[PDB]
Design a binder for this molecule. Structure first.
Ligand SMILES: N[C@@H](Cc1ccccc1)C(=O)O
Ligand SMILES: [Co+2]
Ligand SMILES: [Co+2]
Lengths: 380, 380
């Protein structure tokens, strides 16, 4: 049941911004590992004496990597005379974030009809303001409110119908057209110490509604058309094995973004391409489930995948779960950096064809049961 | 002439340690871009709750990449009970280094016969102590003195993997890349004043000035007894038409530090082919190629050393060639390794001075300043 109670006009996920120590090395690693193209830059070569920012794109997916230069380069500037292309940037905020959290997501950005309006209604509805609406070259408006921890939900709106003003397109020579099938951001998942207040706060200022489905507790906030999806986890203390949400909070120094789910238009090509590169600069994957798991998928999704595609799931380590309206293919990378905090999920959804409706197949809630049952039958 | 005035026994370059914000991402980018294998780790998975350190190797070349975890993980520890594998590591020193300089070299490590004596005689002879000698598992001794800026010269000695507490990387995770890079040839620092820098360093090491043979800078080279440890030092020349890039280094780096690392390849042509293949898919970019006239003038000076077939290969790969009276030098420079116009890498191969090859054979390319200004005027 979808009340469609959005308090302002939300369109889609627009980009994800990583705050880094060195944007160059993180970005080049991510480009190779994920098959994303360098598509825009704002840095010393574009006149930006404040921060270095490099944009990777794959389909509609936009990963932005930003790091601070020495404040001495911009010591003479003031906010009216700034050369930063992203006016919310702050040297001290950025260095604090990185030293506290390590490599991680600073902004979950959604496009909206009117960023100034979305900021005002949000703050009027309990949102903690982070950066006030600022209009960039009379073309784009951007505004920020706190989401959880030091993560901000960023509103961006365009008068027109090129990422942001001040960013230049990167030269063809430095833009090799990598592509492993990733097409768009499906959802972004946060970890917090307690679920209730985080939900009450975010649902409070957005009007996002709870999305139904079927060592943690979780719930998913969703926009009107359920294309902006924001699950949130809290830890369940007392279990035999220590909750990984708790281990997240410990290594991240509190709440933050836990993982990003990237939709692929062909999850088999994506996993083949990423797994080719795991040990030559790309990303590692979580240990595959036992073949037990895969023997039992026939009874579950033999309706939906052939024996060959089930066998191909076993090669790549893919997981499969299923709602009452669709089926979900998913796999999880290992942590993206030094700490056991942020990781990436690759997914592909099958079913619920209207285009495809959001969250088709759910988010993998069934795979807790099927993992313990598969590990218990592989031991036998 | 060479007085062999080393004040303690110095063997070879042992490793170079980068101080990072995230060691994983820098290390994986460097591994792909340079063709270096992952060979040892010290991190959470090895019991290290303080720092994450990852070692890449190519031949004898050792690149160590280190970043701090959250201090909270090691709050109960004291130096006697530390789990850091590198006892000189300090959270606050590391974060201060990285926020001041960005990505850069913290330690230039040379192996010596006895690290304690090397430290003792060093500070006895004016060296500013950085970390006193510490004996690692009764096997390795480690000591550090200040070199220039926030860079330290690190002494390592073995009584008999990399260091105690570093584990070998699982072969599944250790893919055997190799583009021909074999060892560290020399390491170059930029300082605001050359004279006092040389006086200091030559002062406490006993290294002697290595003899070589209007634009840029002034520089000089300190060398160990057998001239295998080579440390050039630069200072800017102010007042010129074009900004001294030593001066631009100092500004963007917030003062003195390591400018570039020169890596010896056993086949510069293969190395440059392999690196240039990956420039746009996660690797390193190279400085603009010299004009074709630079290569037309190569026959008159090195036609005696390289065939037309080897001179043509130099021009497609952008390699530069210089020559003193004892040997011939092939060299090329990368673009900066990260966000700031500070540290970069040089690939080199030396031709001649066999008796082994003796150090510095062919010089360091000082003649390429006259030949680059010439060629630009001829191609006009
Ligand atoms: N002049 C130093 C290093 C350097 C190289 C290139 C540019 C500036 C400085 C040398 O001995 O090679
Ligand atoms: Co998910
Ligand atoms: Co050099």
């Amino acid at each position: 049941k979808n009340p469609k109670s959005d308090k302002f006009k939300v369109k889609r996920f627009h980009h994800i911004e990583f705050w880094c120590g060195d944007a160059t090395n993180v970005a080049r690693r991510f480009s190779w590992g994920l098959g994303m193209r360098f598509s825009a830059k704002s840095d010393l070569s574009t006149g930006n004496m404040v921060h270095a920012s490099y944009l990777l794109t794959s389909g509609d997916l936009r990963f932005l990597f930003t790091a601070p230069y020495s404040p001495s380069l911009s010591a003479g500037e003031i906010k009216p005379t700034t050369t930063a292309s992203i006016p919310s940037f702050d040297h001290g905020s950025c260095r604090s974030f990185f030293s506290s959290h390590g490599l991680g997501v600073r902004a979950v950005a959604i496009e909206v009809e009117d960023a100034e309006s979305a900021f005002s209604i949000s703050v009027a509805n309990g949102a903690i303001p982070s950066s006030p609406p600022i209009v960039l070259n009379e073309a784009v408006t951007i505004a920020e409110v706190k989401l959880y921890g030091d993560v901000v939900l960023r509103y961006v709106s365009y008068k027109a119908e090129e990422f942001l003003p001040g960013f230049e397109r990167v030269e063809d020579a430095s833009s090799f057209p990598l592509d492993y099938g990733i097409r768009r951001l499906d959802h972004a998942v946060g970890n917090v110490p307690e679920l209730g207040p985080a939900l009450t706060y975010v649902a409070g200022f957005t009007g996002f509604h709870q999305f139904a489905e079927f060592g943690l507790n979780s719930a998913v906030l969703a926009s009107n058309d359920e294309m902006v999806l924001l699950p949130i986890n809290e830890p369940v203390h007392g279990t035999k094995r220590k909750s990984q949400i708790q281990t997240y909070l410990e290594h991240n120094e509190g709440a933050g973004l836990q993982h990003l789910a990237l939709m692929s238009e062909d999850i088999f090509r994506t996993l083949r391409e990423m797994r080719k590169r795991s040990s030559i600069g790309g990303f590692d994957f979580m240990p595959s489930p036992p073949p037990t798991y895969y023997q039992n998928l026939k009874k579950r999704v033999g309706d939906v995948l052939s024996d060959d595609q089930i066998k191909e799931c076993e090669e790549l380590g893919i997981l499969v779960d299923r709602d009452d309206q669709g089926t979900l293919l998913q796999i999880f990378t290992k942590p993206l950096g030094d700490r056991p905090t942020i990781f990436i999920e690759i997914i592909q959804r099958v079913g619920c064809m209207m285009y495809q409706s959001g969250g088709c197949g759910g988010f993998g809630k069934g795979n807790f049961s099927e993992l313990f049952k598969s590990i218990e039958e592989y031991e036998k």
